[PDB]
Amino acid sequence: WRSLSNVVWGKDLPAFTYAFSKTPLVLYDGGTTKQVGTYNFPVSKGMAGVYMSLEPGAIRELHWHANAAEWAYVMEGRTRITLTSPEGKVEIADVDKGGLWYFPRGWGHSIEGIGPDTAKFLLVFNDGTFSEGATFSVTDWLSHTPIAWVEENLGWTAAQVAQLPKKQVYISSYGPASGPLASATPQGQTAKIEVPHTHNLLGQQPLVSLGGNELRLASAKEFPGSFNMTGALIHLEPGAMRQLHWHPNADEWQYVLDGEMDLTVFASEGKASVSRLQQGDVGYVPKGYGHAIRNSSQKPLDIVVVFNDGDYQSIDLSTWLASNPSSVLGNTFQISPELTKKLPVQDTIFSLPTQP
Amino acid sequence: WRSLSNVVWGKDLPAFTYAFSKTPLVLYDGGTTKQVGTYNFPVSKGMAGVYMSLEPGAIRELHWHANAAEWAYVMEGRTRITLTSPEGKVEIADVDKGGLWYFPRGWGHSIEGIGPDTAKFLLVFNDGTFSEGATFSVTDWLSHTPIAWVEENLGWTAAQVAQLPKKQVYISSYGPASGPLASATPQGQTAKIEVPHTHNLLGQQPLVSLGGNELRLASAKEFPGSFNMTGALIHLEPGAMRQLHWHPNADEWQYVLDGEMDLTVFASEGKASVSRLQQGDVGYVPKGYGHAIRNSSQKPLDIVVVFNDGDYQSIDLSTWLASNPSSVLGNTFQISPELTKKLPVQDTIFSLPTQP
Amino acid sequence: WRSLSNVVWGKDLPAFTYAFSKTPLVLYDGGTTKQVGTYNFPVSKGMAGVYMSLEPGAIRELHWHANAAEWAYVMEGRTRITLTSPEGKVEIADVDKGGLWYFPRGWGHSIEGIGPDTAKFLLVFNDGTFSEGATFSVTDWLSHTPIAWVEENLGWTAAQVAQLPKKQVYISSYGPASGPLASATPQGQTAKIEVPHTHNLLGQQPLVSLGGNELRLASAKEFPGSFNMTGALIHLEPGAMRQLHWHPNADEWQYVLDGEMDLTVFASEGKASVSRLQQGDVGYVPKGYGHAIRNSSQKPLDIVVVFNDGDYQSIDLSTWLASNPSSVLGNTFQISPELTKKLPVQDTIFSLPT
Ligand code: NI
Ligand code: NI
Ligand code: NI
Ligand code: NI
Ligand code: NI
Ligand code: NI
């Protein structure tokens, strides 16, 4: 990738991509997981990412984490979530392929794979240090509380408390697998959360469409329950680009759903990087850094990108240059008036291949 | 206190209690004080606590501290406060036993003991590094300003300025003791603060009551002047329990007003603690940590707890488990369907010992 | 300067002033600049300051910086700015002597000197680590992107892209100089920003005026586009002072426009400083520290001060003492009832030489 400056790509910069596709899975009874955050991907301060799979009837047990909100995208299969708020209200809902959930920091929750095959999903947390090994587990909790107090709290005998787990379960396939949603009723009378905390992203109409390239955007305008986090699906045809831009207000976390992705990141001070991501790899663009995404392959590319702000803000280079008068542009770029007039006058968000 | 995990209580964790009852008082002319913060209680990052007493006519001099808001609970006696805002408005008020004040960050204030008894009160600051040795004193200020500028600022002669203190006074019993509230008028025409910054907590009816156990809560709903701090009084009868819960949004600072308190703290990653607090000792539960409080004694227990958020948010274990369906609970806890149905179906906030 | 305590001025404290007047300029083709922030002025954590000049037709190139909002005061001459928001709207405006601009964090912008004279202005950033060497330059950007992707994004050939700069331009005099404002139209159809992000500070009537001493204040009340920063102009006559006060909510950054300024700063724990600032020097008062400013010279003093909050909050000593009853004051200061009654009963903001 030649540049006008002949910059040494990546020099004096952290990695902006991580080979998450090669990270080994941790295996549980009915599920798998792996994660990427500042502990293995130092640039990724604003968000951490978790891959999880759950077989039918496998549950990610009831837990909470007050250090991070949890935004999710279901890649394959079907899940059911439960979510309990400090007002004592509950949301119990199916989330299918292409759907989202958002669990506010510290609200209690569970996730179950409901089949018929493997559920596979991404979890993105708005704390880059988040680790799935550091969540607050209800089974860990009750096995790390004095037995006599658990007895009193539950109205249970010692012999009943002795039947509870002795350590953090994390993922269970003990069972039973949950049944139809209409029968998934709280054991005790519980009012229902009314603001939706699940959402259908893949089923949205594209916010932007150009020559088969598509952007589907779920910010707080589309999904207000996710009040401080935004997600988008980008589909790029062979040769096409998401145009050069930056985000004034948010970091950007990226996962390649399928295909092969090229990312370039401009970091100021004459420093920049370019790298290729395979399916299942991760990218991270710090707030304010200039960047673009290109499909340099002969096959389609699909990515999910996540922002740690509920308001999607992008300034495209094309918009920026179109907004300025000729004199400012010619003086800035030190170019002829003739060439100045050929700078962008409109922003199409994507760029179609121009190479004949 | 046996547990299902046989966890070594306190292993790999900071102390969550501090033997504040044994901290020596610092003695002033008509007052005493002592304090606990990150400097001696490392876990206590969000809040620091100060004990202070003032004899009749003793004043904690005019001072300010822009690094911390100041929330107070008067344990004994009567105080008079003054509070001056950047709007140039003043609040002059009596605060008696069971009452609160809240001084916003950086607003100027004073506190006087009003007789015939000694005033004793707790001050909780929303910065764990706060120290009473590091406040901005008006007598320190004027003795550390060029004399010629103090003369000009006050319209005073050298001989008048020479009568001012040469250093921080801190606490003074020079006099005069203040008279009745209705005669405590500003020396110059000063508009009055209209939003109350004092409040009666002890005189509230309980928010929650069960079997003699009581919770009185002053959040910003009850006391909007204290916009980002909340306090509560908890009364526990012998053998009774404040149920297992966590706070999604706030740290919890605790002081034992009377009795003996048992506290358990669950910190995730299979780590937990349990300890006993005597009267005048202090506890601290970091945001999100699971906790419960038990009176294991034969005498009543009374505590004050303070949160560094104005919205009280608690998720009780009972609420959480009641909100979930049987399958999720049986799978998580790996227990029989019979036992699953005996999990909580309602939240009574407190739990009671075995009854006749 | 004697004090009641005989405090050693400056003992155990950082510098609260910086000899910015002596900082050397960095020279560009058509402009100059220098800066002061935590890297050379350690106390200055909340704000950094930049001096910049632009010759007629010289431009500070299109750039952005998402780490800092940019507040400006034009000291001499005339500028033209452009400002582009994430809504895809643009503001193109003239800012002359005494005027302000505020560029929100990460919004794209440019600044051009409009002739016939040199434009000289101050930029204050709400991040004390801000450096003009660390901005995101559009010419740096396009020279540090794969050429094939620039071709695609612009619809240009390799030979067209090859005419672009090979590195960060920073300041350019290549031209052309811009024409009249009414002719400075976006190359492509662009909606206009409607909330003003420029403002006339020097032209305001004083918020406070006493004996020739004046304070002009542009907080978010006067200039709502500058939503989280405030600027003020203070004029002090010989012998006059801005009274003792503190700010509960903001740090204060100061620049001496002309004259000679005395600053005192009280830092608690029996520590305080007093320093004299020359024209072009800089002061910084941390949030909550007590302070006062005095003109101890025989000539006028004019300063600009900037706060990293959009709501100007000041508690003057006089207001505070006037708000309290006699008993509280006499007990605090350990003075006679007679002297207690002579403490302040009103706040005139400035104090006059006796
Ligand atoms: Ni979770
Ligand atoms: Ni982006
Ligand atoms: Ni105080
Ligand atoms: Ni609690
Ligand atoms: Ni700038
Ligand atoms: Ni000031």
Author numbering:
A (entry chain B), B (entry chain A): 39 to 394
C (entry chain C): 39 to 392
From the manuscript:
However, MncA might adopt non-native folds with non-cognate metals. Abnormally coordinated metals might not be kinetically trapped. NiII often prefers four-coordinate, planar geometries, and NiII-MncA was chosen for structural analysis. A crystal structure of NiII-MncA (1.6 Å resolution), shows the bi-cupin fold of MnII-MncA with a metal atom in each cupin domain. Each MnII atom is coordinated to three histidine and one glutamate residue with non-protein ligands completing hexacoordinate MnII coordination spheres. NiII-MncA has similar coordination environments with no channel to the amino-terminal NiII and a narrow channel to the carboxy-terminal site analogous to MnII-MncA. The channel is presumed to allow substrate access to catalytic MnII. The substrate site was gratuitously occupied by acetate in the MnII structure and with glycine in the crystalised NiII-form. The narrow hydrophobic channel is unlikely to allow NiII exchange and thus both NiII atoms appear trapped.
Here we use a cyanobacterial MnII-cupin (MncA) as a metal trap, to test predictions of metalation. Two metal-binding cupins, MnII-MncA and CuII-CucA, were discovered in the periplasm of a cyanobacterium (Synechocystis PCC 6803), notably binding metals from different ends of the Irving-Williams series yet exploiting similar folds and identical metal-binding residues. While the copper-cupin is secreted unfolded via the Sec-system, the MnII-cupin is a Tat-substrate which folds and kinetically traps the less competitive metal in the cytosol before secretion. MncA is an MnII-dependent oxalate decarboxylase (inactive with copper or ZnII), and the related cytosolic OxdC from Bacillus subtilis trapped either MnII or CoII in E. coli depending on media metal supplementation.
